Amino acid sequence: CNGFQKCEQLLREYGQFCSKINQALHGANLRQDDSVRNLFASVKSSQSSP
Amino acid sequence: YDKETKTHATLFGSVACEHISSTMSQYSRSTRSMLKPV
């Protein structure tokens, strides 16, 4: 809800479910960053002639 | 969160550096009465 106190009160009852959704999305985003670093690391560590 | 130092910073996503102001009052955050240029 957009700035509605009553929907926020309802959210407090369902807050645990909402927190779980954020944690799962945050974990997925961290995993995507980890995949980016490893792929670039394989490209790196090789001496390159200009 | 920066747990080891315990210091914290607030980031606004894709917002012009000039627009946001310290102690911003133009926008009101319902969730927090108090929230804590570069």
TrEMBL record, chain A:
Superkingdom, taxonomy of origin: Viruses
Portion held of the full protein: 811 to 860 of 1353
Lineage: Viruses, Riboviria, Orthornavirae, Pisuviricota, Pisoniviricetes
Annotated S-S bridges: 1-7
Protein name: Spike protein S2
Position of the signal peptide: none
UniProtKB/TrEMBL annotation, chain B:
Free-text domain note: Fusion peptide 1 (FP1) and fusion peptide 2 (FP2) function cooperatively and have a membrane-ordering effect on lipid headgroups and shallow hydrophobic regions of target bilayers. They are considered as two domains of an extended, bipartite FP. The membrane-ordering activity is calcium-dependent and also dependent on correct folding, which is maintained by an internal disulfide bond in FP2.
Entry protein name: Spike glycoprotein
Location relative to the cell: Virion membrane; Host endoplasmic reticulum-Golgi intermediate compartment membrane; Host cell membrane
PTM comment, free text: Specific enzymatic cleavages in vivo yield mature proteins. The precursor is processed into S1 and S2 by host cell furin or another cellular protease to yield the mature S1 and S2 proteins. Additionally, a second cleavage leads to the release of a fusion peptide after viral attachment to host cell receptor. The cytoplasmic Cys-rich domain is palmitoylated. Spike glycoprotein is digested within host endosomes.
Gene symbol of the encoding locus: S
Source organism (scientific name): Human betacoronavirus 2c (isolate EMC/2012) (HCoV-EMC)
Family the UniProt entry places it in: Belongs to the betacoronaviruses spike protein family.
Superkingdom of this protein's organism: Viruses
Subunit record text: Homotrimer; each monomer consists of a S1 and a S2 subunit. The resulting peplomers protrude from the virus surface as spikes.
Protein role: Spike protein S1: attaches the virion to the cell membrane by interacting with host receptor, initiating the infection. Spike protein S2': Acts as a viral fusion peptide which is unmasked following S2 cleavage occurring upon virus endocytosis.
Upper classification of the organism: Viruses, Riboviria, Orthornavirae, Pisuviricota, Pisoniviricetes
Signal peptide: none
